[PDB]
Amino acid sequence: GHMSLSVAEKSYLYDSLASTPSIRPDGRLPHQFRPIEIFTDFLPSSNGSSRIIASDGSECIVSIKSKVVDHHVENELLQVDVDIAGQRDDALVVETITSLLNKVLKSGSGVDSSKLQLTKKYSFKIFVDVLVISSHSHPISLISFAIYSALNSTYLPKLISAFDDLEVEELPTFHDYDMVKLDINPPLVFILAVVGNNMLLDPAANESEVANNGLIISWSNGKITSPIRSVALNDSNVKSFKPHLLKQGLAMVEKYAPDVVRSLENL
Amino acid sequence: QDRRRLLGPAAAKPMAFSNTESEQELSLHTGFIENCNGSALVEARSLGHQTSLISAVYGPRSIRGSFTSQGTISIQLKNGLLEKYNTNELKEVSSFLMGIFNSVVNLSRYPKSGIDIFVYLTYDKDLTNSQISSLIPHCITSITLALADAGIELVDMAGAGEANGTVVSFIKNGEEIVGFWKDDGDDEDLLECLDRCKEQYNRYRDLMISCLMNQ
Amino acid sequence: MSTFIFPGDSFPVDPTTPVKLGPGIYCDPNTQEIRPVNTGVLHVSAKGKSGVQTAYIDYSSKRYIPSVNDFVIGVIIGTFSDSYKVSLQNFSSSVSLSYMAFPNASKKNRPTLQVGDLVYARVCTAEKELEAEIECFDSTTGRDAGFGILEDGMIIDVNLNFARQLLFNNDFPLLKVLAAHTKFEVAIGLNGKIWVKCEELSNTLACYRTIMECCQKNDTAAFKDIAKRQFKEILTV
Amino acid sequence: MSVQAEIGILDHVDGSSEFVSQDTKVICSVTGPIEPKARQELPTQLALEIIVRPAKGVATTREKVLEDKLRAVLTPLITRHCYPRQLCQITCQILESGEDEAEFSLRELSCCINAAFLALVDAGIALNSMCASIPIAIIKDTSDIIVDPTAEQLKISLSVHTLALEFVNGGKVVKNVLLLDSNGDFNEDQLFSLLELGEQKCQELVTNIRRIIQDNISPRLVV
Amino acid sequence: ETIEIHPITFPPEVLARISPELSLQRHLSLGIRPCLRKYEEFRDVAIENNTLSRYADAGNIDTKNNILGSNVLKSGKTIVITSITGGIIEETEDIIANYASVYPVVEVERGRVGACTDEEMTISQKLHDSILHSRILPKKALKVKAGVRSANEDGTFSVLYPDELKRKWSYVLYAKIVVLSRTGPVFDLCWNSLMYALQSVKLPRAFIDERASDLRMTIRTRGRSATIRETYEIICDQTKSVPLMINAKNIAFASNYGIVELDPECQLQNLNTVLIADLDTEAEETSIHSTISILAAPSGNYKQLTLMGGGAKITPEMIKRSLLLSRVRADDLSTRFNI
Amino acid sequence: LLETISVPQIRDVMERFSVLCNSNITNSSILLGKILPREEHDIAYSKDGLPNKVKTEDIRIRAQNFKSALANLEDIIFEI
Amino acid sequence: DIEIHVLEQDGGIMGSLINGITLALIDAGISMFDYISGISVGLYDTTPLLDTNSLEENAMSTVTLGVVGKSEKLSLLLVEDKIPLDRLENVLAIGIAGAHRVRDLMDEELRKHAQKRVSNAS
Amino acid sequence: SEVITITKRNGAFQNSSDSQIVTPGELVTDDPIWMRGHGTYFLDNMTYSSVAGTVSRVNRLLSVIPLKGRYAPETGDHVVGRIAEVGNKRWKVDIGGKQHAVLMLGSVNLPGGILRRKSESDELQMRSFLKEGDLLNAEVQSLFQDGSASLHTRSLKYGKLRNGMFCQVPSSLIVRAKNHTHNLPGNITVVLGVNGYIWLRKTSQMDLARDTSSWQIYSDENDPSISNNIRQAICRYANVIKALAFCEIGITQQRIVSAYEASMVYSNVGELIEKNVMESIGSDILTAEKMRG
Amino acid sequence: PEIAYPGKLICPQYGTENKDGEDIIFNYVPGPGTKLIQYEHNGRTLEAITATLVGTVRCEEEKKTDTVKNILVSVLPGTNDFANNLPKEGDIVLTRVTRLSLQRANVEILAVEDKPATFSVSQASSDLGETFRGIIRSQDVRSTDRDRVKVIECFKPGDIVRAQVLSLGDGTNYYLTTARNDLGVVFARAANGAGGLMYATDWQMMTSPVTGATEKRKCAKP
């Protein structure tokens, strides 16, 4: 983990969280998120952009750029690039989140890649660049919210030429000013904390340090979807968990996610 | 090209070729690498896909970086001879494996020490004339064998199973879960996967104990 | 003209004669044989010297290796509890200078020296597998110490041979040629360092330029005449 | 065997040299004994940092082999136990190959050995003995053993050899064979005929080296 | 002052860790070595060729495999796994200019993570050079006899290959050598494994499309025009393959030797140069500074030799005895596995 | 001190353990199984140049002897 | 430790980097002798263009100047493309004048932020 | 019921009595008689500021007080710190300054207190007494040349912290006082370190005896019997401190209790992290202060 | 307890039996190779001794002179390894001196001792700094006159020093001591390995048969 706590502080926090009426250090309920701020459309150079600020100062910036590619040779039509400030590009946390996010936003898994198709030969490759300025816990859910916001305010160039390469084979030409809004359904990634027999949504830094385990659950089209990953939020207090906890977590996300999406899909 | 390796001429281009439930059986061996503290050989053959991977445990050895009441564990997967995987994907499995064995390895017995576990994906043949999900249970089997062969204390024999892109590792006779992995697959198929994987977990655990004892 | 020797050559002196081994000569711990390991001129002291002959090899070198009873010029570079960290020569292993050893020493009493100061110091102890120790005042000194800070002036790099000749050889004209032009003080270190100070900077600079030129040519004759051109050029302005 | 060498050409190094055989020119520098990095430290002996730079391009795995073979020669030459927990940097900058570097590295290796030895002598580092290295080659049509072959001779060679011997007693007694690097097709009879003729030309080289060393160093010393 | 003192003795495993040199001398006084072998006893060798190659089953050739040849070798406690892959590049007496080589990448696992060690980097070069020096692979043996794929009647594709007779291609051989369970000098094991692997290498047939639509690509300058030459996409045959043409007369096999002086103060109750064969264990790798490495051909030709005398003097007798054993070892390795 | 926990309460522990314990109650090599875990063998070439497999037994015998030789051997040393 | 993230680029990025560090360092309460203002000046033919963008930099040589405080002393003089020796002095003169304006804007915004904080805190 | 609060914004990266002020390089005075202090530098008669802040004149001593900067240790400060590392015969503890403070083995009260003879063994075994991550009370005993602090815990008042939770605010919001340990309603006790490090714990017997066992002064063990209300009280008190800090208003023992009782309006505690409640709470604290005048 | 593997249940925390009309209480204590793990079954929780190693299960019990019977349950290796026997406070180790400076003597742990002898050897490499390093302070060299101790006359580079662990220290260095009769330099050669074998004639003196030279060291009592 990140935060450093003494054995006494950890014991107090654990007992408080492992209690049957689970007591959070900030007084939250096991499903309440902390307030966040989101800015969008501030990078005119890009097709889409977002900036999310957490309550603990955690900040993430997402940029969306497009490129015309031949979908017959370019298998992956959506590439996620993660850059955590203070970490090497080949760091364990960076590559893991990068690999994870790319699976969350695959072309034929949790994204309508039909909206990226231009012609019978060419399609729009989407580059999702993530920049984590600051973070005090696992930023996977933080990045997810930013990518969501960014992809819902993205505008792509509009095609002019015909859409049948096979015969006439016209060179892809686009309109000089008009841009079509990218209609797509970005998935969300929720992260949970397992302290004893309790499950917490949006784990704080101190909470994650004493947690026994954790869950990474994706969400798309109003239902639970892969990737689903159990994750050790820390490495000193990791323990095995009963299967009912896993089923509890999936159930917990399944009922509180639409509330999050509703507050996130605001016009 | 590279000043540390001999990669040959740059104008050269790699050779590209053209065109003109099922039961699973595995083989187990431990302690054949004198270079390290513990090692294991896990080979599995089924349908149109066979896998031969090697695990190697180095530790407990000295840690420069920090003081520690308990031990520290690192897991690295390496690509083998022919089959190749994305570095990201190998890192992701490594992280998933770290979480599992941080629940099994008795870290309290190794203060200021490091246990570095290497898993070599030596030979992974795809004979179908995310594939990484089917290799995960075999990795856990190899690491468990290697750790036990090394003499590293384990709470319980950690094993796993795979069913329709879903991987779940069990301990304590399958009562509890030390790791859950799911890619692709279908909807509302959790209960079926848990049962199928627990069957593989039980079979792998029996063969592992049989290997650690008789051999 | 001298009798040059090379490593792996037979040692002239016979084992029947007691010989004290100096620089260049090596006694093999395994085969007990005495053999030369450096390249240069072999010097053997005459017999009758208390029944002990001293044999060594004068070889060219510029990398100093600490030996006991050597006067050296160090630069303070560090603070450690119980002593100064001092460097004899760039990239070389540091030497230690205890707070205890100073001209009016007291355990309570402490040195006023500040990192970056030049010290005229004697190396009392030089263990091969241990950090060098430098002391300003020596028991051998017996209540007389020239050791301590050097103020201002200019320091000069010089090969060990040139420095050794400047310190032990009285026939070396360098000091004399510099005395017939101006009067200044000089500290000489066996670690190949020479400290020069005058009343005016132009004279110290002139001395600096002469010592380097004379060190470069190594022609004993040249310096008195070589010095003359150096003094003249400064007044050129 | 008309080699030419100069000693003490570099200012900011404890010792240096420039050895030239034919078209092969190598300049070498030696600093030591000095403070070593923690990973270099040897509790009882001297640590050697050996670097070889090519005439063209950057250092590759090729030069890594030149560093390794040069290490096998210099290591037993130096009285390392005189400098415990200490470092000696040895750098060789090959200025001119004198051979097709895409095919051979024979002359460059021999010239590096001779230059490194000379640089160690200049630096005043404890040496157990002396050393000389020569390149040798064999031609299939000729059947000859040519000592110090040219680049053109190497192109038509069947085998290439690097021989470096350890000399004592005024360069008359071969203490040992520090390095023999034989590559190509050759038989046992050719090997010993090579070693017999090779030892002769090596002994001649030491004598020439001893001359060069005394000619350069003696003016520095006093009588 | 005449006195008697008694030594304290440490278990052989302990002694080997405490003082490798002493552990060596103790064993040598009883005619054995720290690896429990005698002075001139070699490690046995067990191999398996072409087990990882696509063509390993002639009846069922793998489709998703690019390994042309392979060799799994274990000698004593050290394991070596070699696999040969290939590439193709367009091209535009007994002299060295007429011979090619393989490009090996040897990786040694020792429980560390980071850049390539000096061991791994040097092992690759010596393998590459000795293949070129011993003249195993002539450039002519890598020339691609490219065929042509046309569209025959009834809508089918057929490939016509020439034989015994414009663009020209050449094969390029690569090698990955993984060394497991290292216990000493491992070059000799890498070479012998590479030799066994090269004798199993099958070169895939290569062809081009009869009339690929892709022609020249026009690139314009500042007024003048130019045309980049049409690049033909060379394709390898899925099944058909030809064996690698190796000069079997030149294939040498590796062995190493060491020379030690018996220390009188290390004998156990119950001058001389010692020849030791096939160095293993830390004790031998660390304390023996006079060593000999030989690549000897069964014809008795020697591809390369290395004499490193840093310890005991290498006498002509030691050299001759080493050359003899290298031949005997080579004769064994070459004929054993009928490759 | 220990009066607090009952023999009867502990007895129940033995029961539940027996319940828990009671409830709980070939190898072939496809590819690399044959060569990787190969037992260490040694060879000794004779005067004729023929390879001779050192006895698996031979290695053990030398080891026993070597162990004997050092232990008996170690004890006596006189310095003058 | 000074970490910088360039989110968008459009000419004169070096000058903007200088101004960003100077402001951030002051915010950290880290002592410094004076402001360092950065500016870029292009030279299209004879004409000198203050504060050039990406299009102008691609079409002419530019000079990047770091000016200490209100002084004429340069901390950074950066010329990467060809400039006639006769035009260089005049280009420097334009840049220094422009950098002084950047200093004033930085100083203005800083006193504004300061004043509000003082008002609210006290 | 609301799952989360998200605040959105488009087209923009971010939202957007007289006291003397000065910026670096600005001329403060030209009187050479002045003694230049921190935040300044001089050349002959001219004195220029070395930081952005307000000009301060105490007697003849001209200095510029910075607006921003880390906690600066003064001798005698009551600070709360975390052990960063343990070496030799000293403890290095994170206070929140430019450098770690030192805590020599000599200063701390060893187990058995005065009666136990000084022990060679303890220096080796100190980690057991204290280790990396532990929190503690400490007083800035002395200062080093650079400004670093030497700490001591030679008192019953000082020592290892337990039975509570940690939180921190900017050091500027906590000033020096007669005492920094305070008892509050709800049976909890606050430890307001001058460095900004705050410790909220269950009120112990010592905390009561302050305004009215020596072997276990370094035990990590939290009190076995800590009620939920004490725990739910801690959560409530902690949030309000963060709320005061969010307003950039310095904490007071009075302000804390006042906010704690005023926050009782809101049923659920987890409702003290929201900005609106903090903004309204901050204004409530301030208006009362204005009324007090 | 025929076989032991990691995760296999051994015994409950407590046991009892009936002998001679009296109930004997067996208090099982988790020893080396075991650990008390709380499991769930039938709804009721249960703590049982679980083997954490692979090998033969062994038990020990003891009362010493300085109804409930205390039994120690442990698991030993079945079939060398420096893993399960990592150096802890109080353990005696064999280490080699790597460096000397006036302040302290530095050695790297090579092997560990056991009670009635036998030894445990670290398989790590001394070439890659893979071995656990330690420090012998000047005041921990000997028992008498710990104030005036010259390091150069106690140890030498390359010496094999038998020492006892004082504390784990930091991650970098262990803290050892040689302030006993059976502690100190055990194996050494003259001139830092450049000479012949030296044996411990005197507790403070080392003598070599061929060298004819004596070098002082803080040797273990012969």
Contacts 24+ apart (CB under 8 A), H274-280: H274/A35, H274/H5, H275/A35, H275/H246, H277/H243, H278/H242, H278/H243, H278/H246, H278/H247, H279/H247
Domains C1-61 and C153-237 share a fold: no
Domains I1-79 and I80-222 share a fold: yes
Chain I residues in contact with H85 by the CB 8 A cut-off are: 170
| Rounded Cα gap, residues A228 and B91, in angstroms | 16
Q: What token pair was written down for I106?
A: 């530095």
CATH 3.40.50.720, domain H19-71, yes or no: no
- Residue A149 phi/psi, 5-degree rounding, is -60, -40
Domain with CATH 2.40.50.100 in chain H: 19-71
- Among D221, H193, G4, H167, which residue's Cα sits nearest to residue C41? D221
| Rounded Cα gap, residues D21 and B114, in angstroms | 53
The dihedral built from the CA positions of residue C27, C31, C35 and C37, taken in this order, carries a sign that is negative
Angle in degrees, CA E227, E233, E235, rounded to 5: 170
Chain I residues in contact with E3 by the CB 8 A cut-off are: 201
Residue of G35, G118, G120 to mutate, interface with H, max H Cβ within 10 Å: G118
CATH 2.60.40.10, domain C62-152, yes or no: no
Determine if the peptide bond prior to A227 is cis (ω within 30°).
Answer: yes
Residue of H124, H125, H131, H132 to mutate, interface with I, max I Cβ within 10 Å: H124
Q: After which residues is chain B broken (C to N over 2.5 A)?
A: 20, 129
Distance in Å, alpha carbon of B193 to nearest chain A alpha carbon: 12
Domain boundaries, chain B: 1-215
Nearest residue on chain G to A49, alpha-carbon basis: G7
Question: A50 has which bridge partners?
Answer: A40, A62
End-to-end alpha carbon distance in chain B? 47
CATH architecture of the domain formed by I80-222: Beta Barrel (2.40)
Determine A/D contact with 3+ CB pairs under 8 A as the test.
no
| Rounded Cα gap, residues H266 and H270, in angstroms | 9
**Residues E196 and E49 sit within 8 Å (Cβ to Cβ):** yes
CATH of C1-61, one of 2.40.50.220, 2.40.50.100, 3.40.50.850, 2.60.40.10: 2.40.50.100
Determine C/A contact with 3+ CB pairs under 8 A as the test.
no
Determine B/A contact with 3+ CB pairs under 8 A as the test.
yes
**Residues C68 and C123 sit within 8 Å (Cβ to Cβ):** yes
Cβ–Cβ contact E178 with B under 8 A: yes
Count of domains observed in chain A? 1
Contacts of C54 (CB under 8 A, 6+ apart): C19, C20, C22, C44, C45
Residue of B67, B69, B70, B112 to mutate, interface with H, max H Cβ within 10 Å: B67
For every residue of A161-224, DSSP letters joined together read S-S-TTTT-----EEEEEEEE------EEEEEEEETTEEEES--HHHHHH-SEEEEEEEETTEE
Q: What token pair was written down for A38?
A: 């989101």
Nearest residue on chain F to B45, alpha-carbon basis: F30
Q: DSSP character for I194?
A: T
Can you list the positions of beta strands (E) in chain D?
Answer: 4-7, 15-21, 24-34, 46-53, 86-96, 130-138, 145-147, 159-168, 173-186
For every residue of E189-239, DSSP letters joined together read HHHHHHHHHHTT-EEEEEEEETT-S---EEEE-SS-EEEEPPPP--EEEEE
- CB contacts < 8 A (D, I): 21
Three-state secondary structure of H27-86: EEECCCCCEECCCEEEECCEEEECCCEEEEEECCEEEEEECCCCCCCCCCCEEEEEEEEE
Count of domains observed in chain E? 1
User: CATH for I1-79?
Assistant: 2.40.50.880
Buried b (16+ CB within 10 A) or exposed e, G65-79: bbbbbbeeebeeeee
Q: What token pair was written down for I96?
A: 């080699």
Do the Cβ atoms of I175 and H87 come within 8 Å? Answer: no
Do the Cβ atoms of F36 and B41 come within 8 Å? Answer: yes
| Rounded Cα gap, residues B57 and B74, in angstroms | 10
- CB contacts < 8 A (C, D): 102
Contacts of C50 (CB under 8 A, 6+ apart): none
Domain boundaries, chain I: 1-79, 80-222
Do the Cβ atoms of I167 and H124 come within 8 Å? Answer: yes
Superfamily of structural domain C153-237: K Homology domain, type 1 (3.30.1370.10)
Q: What token pair was written down for E277?
A: 């064969």
- Residue E91 phi/psi, 5-degree rounding, is -110, 135
| Rounded Cα gap, residues B162 and B132, in angstroms | 11
Residue C74 corresponds to which amino acid?
G
Superfamily of structural domain B1-215: GHMP Kinase, N-terminal domain (3.30.230.70)
Interface of B with I in 14-33 (CB under 8 A): none
Cβ–Cβ contact H254 with A under 8 A: no
Do the Cβ atoms of A256 and H3 come within 8 Å? Answer: yes
Residue of B25, B27, B55, B205 to mutate, interface with F, max F Cβ within 10 Å: B27
Q: What is the resolution of this structure in A?
A: 3.8
DSSP H helices, C30-169, are 160-168
Determine C/F contact with 3+ CB pairs under 8 A as the test.
no
Q: B107: helix, coil or strand?
A: helix
Do the Cβ atoms of I11 and F13 come within 8 Å? Answer: no
Residue D79 corresponds to which amino acid?
T
| Rounded Cα gap, residues A101 and A129, in angstroms | 11
Question: I206 has which bridge partners?
Answer: I215
The partner residue sitting opposite B157, judged by closest CB among I5, I39, I41, is I5
Three-state secondary structure of H252-266: CHHHHHHHHHHHHHC
Contacts of C212 (CB under 8 A, 6+ apart): C156
Residue of F7, F15, F24, F80 to mutate, interface with I, max I Cβ within 10 Å: F7
The partner residue sitting opposite I170, judged by closest CB among H87, H120, H125, is H87
The dihedral built from the CA positions of residue E47, E52, E55 and E57, taken in this order, carries a sign that is positive
**Residues B76 and B119 sit within 8 Å (Cβ to Cβ):** yes
Chain D residues in contact with B3 by the CB 8 A cut-off are: 58-61
Buried b (16+ CB within 10 A) or exposed e, A44-80: eebbbbbbbbbbeebbbbbbbbbeebebeeeeebbbb
Residue of D39, D44, D79 to mutate, interface with I, max I Cβ within 10 Å: D44
The partner residue sitting opposite F79, judged by closest CB among I15, I44, I201, is I201
**Residues D186 and E297 sit within 8 Å (Cβ to Cβ):** no
- Beta strand H188-192 with H181-184: parallel, antiparallel or unpaired? antiparallel
Distance in Å, alpha carbon of A170 to nearest chain B alpha carbon: 30
Domain boundaries, chain C: 1-61, 62-152, 153-237
Alpha-carbon distances of I34 from A241, B60, H20, I25, rounded to whole Å: 21, 18, 71, 21
Buried b (16+ CB within 10 A) or exposed e, H13-32: eeeeeeeebbbbbbebbeee
Do the Cβ atoms of C6 and D175 come within 8 Å? Answer: no
Percent of chain F as helix, strand, coil, to the nearest 5 = 50, 10, 40
Do the Cβ atoms of A226 and B184 come within 8 Å? Answer: yes
Do the Cβ atoms of G8 and A43 come within 8 Å? Answer: yes
Nearest residue on chain G to H51, alpha-carbon basis: G31
**Residues I128 and E112 sit within 8 Å (Cβ to Cβ):** yes
Count of domains observed in chain D? 1
Q: What is the CATH number of the domain that holds A95?
A: 3.30.230.70
Q: Show the domain range for D5.
A: 1-223
Q: What is the CATH number of the domain that holds D147?
A: 3.30.230.70
Q: Show the domain range for A184.
A: 1-267
The partner residue sitting opposite I194, judged by closest CB among C30, C96, C130, is C30
| Rounded Cα gap, residues A62 and C16, in angstroms | 87
**Residues E125 and E150 sit within 8 Å (Cβ to Cβ):** no
Nearest residue on chain I to E7, alpha-carbon basis: I199
| Rounded Cα gap, residues B30 and E92, in angstroms | 52
Chain I residues in contact with D41 by the CB 8 A cut-off are: 98-99
**Residues B37 and B57 sit within 8 Å (Cβ to Cβ):** yes
Can you list the positions of beta strands (E) in D68-222?
Answer: 86-96, 130-138, 145-147, 159-168, 173-186
Nearest residue on chain C to D175, alpha-carbon basis: C8
Chain H residues in contact with I174 by the CB 8 A cut-off are: none
- Residue D80 phi/psi, 5-degree rounding, is -70, -25
Question: E241 has which bridge partners?
Answer: E204
Cβ–Cβ contact D30 with C under 8 A: no
| Rounded Cα gap, residues B43 and A109, in angstroms | 31
Cβ–Cβ contact I147 with C under 8 A: no
For every residue of A57-95, DSSP letters joined together read S-EEEEEEEEEEEETTT---SEEEEEEETTS-TT-HHHH
